[PDB]
Each structure stands twice: as structure tokens, then as C-alpha cells.
């Protein structure tokens, strides 16, 4: 699907002139996010439009980069991850099994399943609950 909604989904300011008959009639801009992180070929040469895409969307990753594991995948372009860690209990002088759930935007370029180990980064907040955009997946 290329017209998944009732508006002409396209990245803005890109104009391909019909006057010139270039072989590549669909111009796809992207950006090397860098930060020591690679840009997937599926992203740089996909056929999807995503403004929240960490590598093709008009939002930059910056600040904090965090790791997690995929829990639920019943949701479009966004996946929640689980962080487990140790706790600071002074009374019994111990740790404790702690868990947290962090929803994060995911780009259609990457492929995800439940149980994958993924890394995400901080971006400008987009929705009421989401705060982050993925940058890599990894098999587990």
C-alpha cells in the first residue's frame, strides 16, 4: 500500500519535475543519522512515507539512547519495549526484580518480532505517551 490514508502522503518539499524524464521518477531523500549508527538500505531506498522515521522522517535522534526488548506488536509503526533491572531496597538490603514498559516509535523499514533486543533514541515528543524512536533491532 502506498496511499494508506485519504491524504497524499509524501515527504514535503520534494518536487520531481515531470518536464525531465529521469529514470528514477521517485526521488527519495534520506539522512545519515550517524551517531555511530548505520542507515538501513530498506530505509534509504524504501517506498514508504514516514515523518517519524528515525532515518527518513523529519525528526532527529539526540540525547539519550536506550535498550529494551519487544513485548507487544498489535500496533502500527510503534512498539513497546521492556526494561528489567535491579532495585534499591534499604530495609532488607537487596535488589528486586523491576520492570518498566516504554512505547517507542518504530519505522516500517526495520523488521521486528517479540523477544528481539532493540535500541532506541530520544526525539521530540510526538504523542501523549510516546517519547522515543527506535534506531536498531537485533536478533535474540
Amino acid at each position: 500500500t502506498v496511499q494508506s490514508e485519504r491524504a497524499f502522503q509524501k515527504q514535503p518539499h520534494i518536487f520531481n519535475n515531470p518536464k525531465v524524464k529521469t529514470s528514477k521518477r521517485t526521488k527519495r531523500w534520506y539522512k545519515n543519522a550517524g551517531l555511530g549508527f548505520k542507515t538501513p538500505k530498506t530505509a534509504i531506498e524504501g517506498s514508504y512515507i514516514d515523518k517519524k522515521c528515525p532515518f527518513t522522517g523529519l525528526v532527529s535522534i539526540r540525547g539519550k539512547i536506550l535498550t529494551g526488548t519487544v513485548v507487544s506488536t498489535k500496533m502500527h509503526r510503534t512498539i513497546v519495549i521492556r526494561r528489567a533491572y535491579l532495585h534499591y531496597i534499604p530495609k532488607y538490603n537487596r535488589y528486586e526484580k523491576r520492570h518498566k514498559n516504554v512505547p517507542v516509535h518504530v519505522s516500517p523499514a526495520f523488521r521486528v518480532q517479540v523477544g528481539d533486543i532493540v535500541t532506541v533514541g530520544q526525539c521530540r515528543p510526538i504523542s501523549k505517551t510516546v517519547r522515543f524512536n527506535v534506531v536498531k533491532v537485533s536478533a535474540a
Partner: protein, 177 residues
Amino acid sequence: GISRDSRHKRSATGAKRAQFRKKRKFELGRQPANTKIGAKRIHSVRTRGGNKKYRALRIETGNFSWASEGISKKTRIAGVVYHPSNNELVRTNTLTKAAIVQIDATPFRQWFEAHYGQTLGKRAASAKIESSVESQFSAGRLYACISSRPGQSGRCDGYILEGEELAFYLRRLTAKK
């Protein structure tokens, strides 16, 4: 007034908060300048700092540009033909960004005649235009897409739909009618 924050909404763990402090000036919400076709009516609002935001409520003239040739001109408006916000808004003729409209073709016709000498309808390599757009010229009635935010600048600046997106929104128009 029209609030802006989100503490009035529930939490993400299934809970409802309480009141923290009253509405302040730095979370203002204001009226949409829902513009209809009419006499150019622009209102000035002095906003935070020394800003001057102009909101239009009736408009009959806007600036629109042809892309492939690369020209731009002031022009009238017939009126909205489509806007994915609400078809009822389209019917009521509410001007808004990312909307589809019908616009006059006589200014571009005069431009083409003056610059080219070949009258559209009925330097050929540079005078070739799309079949749909030249039929629109012959009828005198062209299409366009407006994407200027109304209640920010009171301006209506857009482009005439080129072949791919022109046919895209034309098939949308036909699926409507």
C-alpha cells in the same frame, strides 16, 4: 479559555489526576480562522512578544504557482473542491491548508498567450502541457491545491496540481462524485 496542556487527561497507567494550578497565559488556545470564499477579511492579533498574527475569515484571492514551467501568479478562487479534513467542511467551503480547490485559468491563459503566442486549447516543445490541464484551460476552469495555514498568516498560497498528483486528486474527486 481554550487550554493547551494535557494534565486534564488520564494517565498511561489507568488513573485520573487532580488540579495542579489554574490556566495560565502561556498555554493559550484560540479560535480557528475558518475562512470562507468572500471579500478578503484579515484580522490582526498582537501575540506574545511583538508578534503580529493575521487570521483571514473571508478570502477570494490567493497566490498560486505552476510547477513544471515554473511560474507563479496571483489569482481568484472558484472555491474548495476537496479537503481530507471533512467533506462537510468542503461543502461549507472552509478554506484550510492541504485542501483541493478550483481556481481560475484566465490569468495563466493570458500569460501563456503573451509569452508563447500559441493559445492553449482547441516553441511547441515548451508549449506542450498536460491534456487535463489544457482541457481545464479551454473550459477556463483549473484545479489547485492550497497548503497555507489560514489562521497563522491569513495567506492562501499554493500550487496547481501537476500530472501525477493532479490525476491522483482527480480520481479522488471522481470517487467522491
